[PDB]
Design a protein around this ligand. Structure first.
Ligand code: HEM
Ligand code: HEM
Ligand code: HEM
Ligand code: HEM
Lengths: 146, 141, 141, 146
C-alpha cells in the first residue's frame, strides 16, 4: 500500500463530496444483496427477506453510517491503517469471524457505489487510488488473522 | 445459469450500454490496468498507454464477446467455447484476474448507467460476469 | 467443465470409497472443524466432539450427497437443487467454507487411498468438489 | 500464527521424517497439475506438456527442493515468519507478480502431499497444526503485497 501525492489529494477531494448519511448505507445494503451469505452476519437487523427489504432495512442503513465513519477514519490516517483499524480487526476476526475475502468485497462494492454516484468524475486514475485505499482497509481489518 | 429476473436485468443494463459497448470495454481494460498493474503482464506486446489504439481495439473484442454472451445467455459454454481454450489453455490467465476485469466492468457500467445500475441490476450483472468468467476459466477435453 | 477424463477419474476413485463413505465423510468433517474452527459455528446444535454420533451421522449424509453427485455428473446441478437451497439460501454458508471441506475431503482420501490419489486423479477430484461447491452456492431457484 | 507447544513439537516430529529431496517436487508438480494456470510462472522449466511430464520434470523437482527448504526455515522459527520471508515476499510479489491466493493453494497442496505419504499418521490434529504453519507461511509471503 502507498498512494502517491496526487492519488491522496484526489481521494480526499472526491470524499468531501460524499453524502455521509447514505453512501455507507447503500454500500452495506448492496453487499447483503449482491453477496447473500453476508446476510448471516446481520440476522439481528430485521427484515432481510428480499433484496428490496435489505435496501430498505433501516438498521442496515444506520450501521452503514458507522461503516462509512470507519472508512473516513482510515482515510484520515492513510499511513497507519493497521493501528487505526486494530480494534476493529479484533472484533471482526476474533469475535465475528468474518472471512477476510468479504472485506475485499465490501471495499469493492463501496467503489461501485462511488462510481455510481459520481459518474464520469470517477476516473480510472481516481478508481485506482480508491482501490489502494479499500485494499489497505481490508488488509488492516484482516490483520488479527495473520 | 441465470434466473429469469437476472436475464431481464442484464438485457436492460446491456441494452442501455448499446452502441457504446466497445468504448466501455476499452474503459474497463484501462481501469483494470491502472487499478491492478499486474494484469498488464498478460499483454506484454501491447501498448497500454492512455487512449492507445490497441486497447480500444481490445475493448471492442471484449465488448463484442460480452454482447454475444448476452444473446446466448442460456448456452454461453457453447457460444464462448473458443474463448476458454484461449484464456485457460493457451494464456493460462490466473482465475483471480477475471474478478478484477469483472469488477472493472461493473465499475464502468456504474459510472455510465446512473439510473439502471440499481442494487438488483448490479447483483444481476455481477452473476452474469461471474458466469462468463466461469466459462472462460474452464477446461474440458 | 468435467471432461471425460475427470469424470472417468472421479467415478474411478470415489467408487473406491466403498463402505468407507460415511467413515471418510465424518473424518473430513472432523478434519474441517479442528483445522478451521470457524466452520463449527454453522453447527450450533451439534455435539461436535471427537467421536460424536452426530458427526458420524452427518458424515454419512455428506458422503451420499457426493455419490449421487458422481452418478449425475452431467447434471449435478439437478441431483442437488435441494442442497443448494439449503446451504446458500437458508443457511447462508460463506463460500470459502466449501473450499475448506473440499480440501479436507481431498486429505481424507489421500490419507486413505494413496494409489488412487495420483496427480491426475487429485486434479480431477479437486475439479469435481469445486463444481459441487459451485452448485451448492448457486442461484436459480 | 500461534502453534501450541504440543502442535509445534508435532509438526517438528513429522517434518523430521520428510524426504527433503522429494516432497517439494511432489507439492510443486502437483500444484501445476491441479491449478494449471500456475504453470505460467515456470514455463522456462521446460517440459510441462502433461501430468507425467510435470511430475518427472527435473527443473520442477529441484525447485521443489528449494520450496521445501524455505518451508523448513519457517518451521525452524515459527515466531518470525515475516522476517524469514521478507525478501521472499518481495521477490514473489514485486518481481514475479504471483497472486497471493496461490500461496494458500501451494500450502494446501503440500498438506495433501503429507497426508498422501504419512497415511493414517497424518491425523486431524497434526493436520490442524500444519494448517497454521502453512497459513502463516502464505501470510508472511503475501506481506510485501500490502
Ligand atoms: C471492509 C470494511 C469494513 C469496515 C470499515 C467495518 C466497520 C464496522 C464498524 C465501524 C463497526 C461497528 C461496531 C459494532 O457494531 O459492533 C462494524 C461492525 C460489524 N461489522 Fe463491519 N466493517 C467492514 C466489513 C465487514 C464485513 C464484510 C462484514 C460482514 C461480512 C461485517 C460485519 C459486521 C458486523 C456483523 C458488525 C456488527 C455488530 C453489530 O451487530 O452491531 N463488517 N463494522
Ligand atoms: C469478461 C471477461 C473476458 C472476456 C469476455 C474476454 C474476451 C476476450 C476476447 C474476445 C479476446 C480475443 C480473442 C481472439 O483474439 O480470438 C480476448 C483476448 C485476450 N484476453 Fe480476454 N476476456 C476476458 C477476461 C480476460 C482476463 C481477466 C485477462 C487477463 C487479465 C484476459 C487476457 C486476454 C489476453 C492476454 C488476450 C489475448 C491478447 C493478445 O495477445 O492478442 N482476458 N479476451
Ligand atoms: C461437499 C460439500 C458439501 C456437501 C456435499 C454437503 C452435504 C450436506 C447434506 C447432504 C446435508 C443434510 C441434508 C438433510 O438431510 O436435510 C447437509 C446439511 C448441512 N450442511 Fe452441508 N454439505 C457440504 C458443505 C457444507 C459446508 C462447507 C458447511 C459449513 C462449513 C455445511 C453446513 C451444513 C449445515 C450446517 C447443514 C445442516 C445441518 C443440521 O443442522 O442438521 N455443509 N449438507
Ligand atoms: C507459499 C509458499 C511458497 C514458498 C515456500 C516458495 C519459496 C520459493 C523459493 C525458496 C524460491 C527461490 C528463490 C531463490 O532461490 O532466490 C521461490 C522462487 C519462485 N517461486 Fe515460490 N514459493 C511459494 C509459492 C509460490 C507460488 C504459489 C508460485 C506460483 C503460483 C511461486 C512461483 C515462484 C517462481 C516462478 C519462482 C522461481 C523463479 C525461477 O527460478 O525462474 N512461488 N519460491
Amino acid at each position: 500500500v502507498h498512494l502517491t501525492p496526487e492519488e491522496k489529494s484526489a481521494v480526499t477531494a472526491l470524499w468531501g463530496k460524499v453524502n455521509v448519511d447514505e453512501v455507507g448505507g447503500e454500500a452495506l445494503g448492496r453487499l447483503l444483496v449482491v453477496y447473500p451469505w453476508t446476510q448471516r452476519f446481520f440476522e439481528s437487523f430485521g427484515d432481510l427477506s428480499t433484496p428490496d427489504a435489505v435496501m430498505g432495512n433501516p438498521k442496515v442503513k444506520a450501521h452503514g453510517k458507522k461503516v462509512l465513519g470507519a472508512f473516513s477514519d482510515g482515510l484520515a490516517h492513510l499511513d497507519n491503517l493497521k493501528g487505526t483499524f486494530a480494534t476493529l480487526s479484533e472484533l471482526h476476526c476474533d469475535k465475528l469471524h468474518v472471512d477476510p475475502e468479504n472485506f475485499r468485497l465490501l471495499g469493492n462494492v463501496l467503489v461501485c457505489v462511488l462510481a455510481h454516484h459520481f459518474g464520469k468524475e470517477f476516473t480510472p486514475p481516481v478508481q485506482a487510488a480508491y482501490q489502494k485505499v479499500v485494499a489497505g482497509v481490508a488488509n488492516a481489518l484482516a490483520h488479527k488473522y495473520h | 445459469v441465470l434466473s429469469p429476473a437476472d436475464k431481464t436485468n442484464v438485457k436492460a443494463a446491456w441494452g442501455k450500454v448499446g452502441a457504446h459497448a466497445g468504448e466501455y470495454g476499452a474503459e474497463a481494460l484501462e481501469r483494470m490496468f491502472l487499478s491492478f498493474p499486474t494484469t498488464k503482464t498478460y499483454f506484454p506486446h501491447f501498448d497500454l498507454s492512455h487512449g492507445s489504439a490497441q486497447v480500444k481495439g481490445h475493448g471492442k473484442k471484449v465488448a463484442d464477446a460480452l454482447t454475444n454472451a448476452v444473446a446466448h445467455v442460456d448456452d454461453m459454454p457453447n457460444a464462448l467455447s473458443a474463448l476458454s481454450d484461449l484464456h485457460a489453455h493457451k494464456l493460462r490467465v490466473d482465475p483471480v484476474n477475471f474478478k478484477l476485469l469483472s469488477h472493472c466492468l461493473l465499475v464502468t457500467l456504474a459510472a455510465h448507467l446512473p439510473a439502471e445500475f440499481t442494487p438488483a441490476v448490479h447483483a444481476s450483472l455481477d452473476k452474469f460476469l461471474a458466469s462468463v468468467s466461469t466459462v472462460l476459466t474452464s477446461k474440458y477435453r
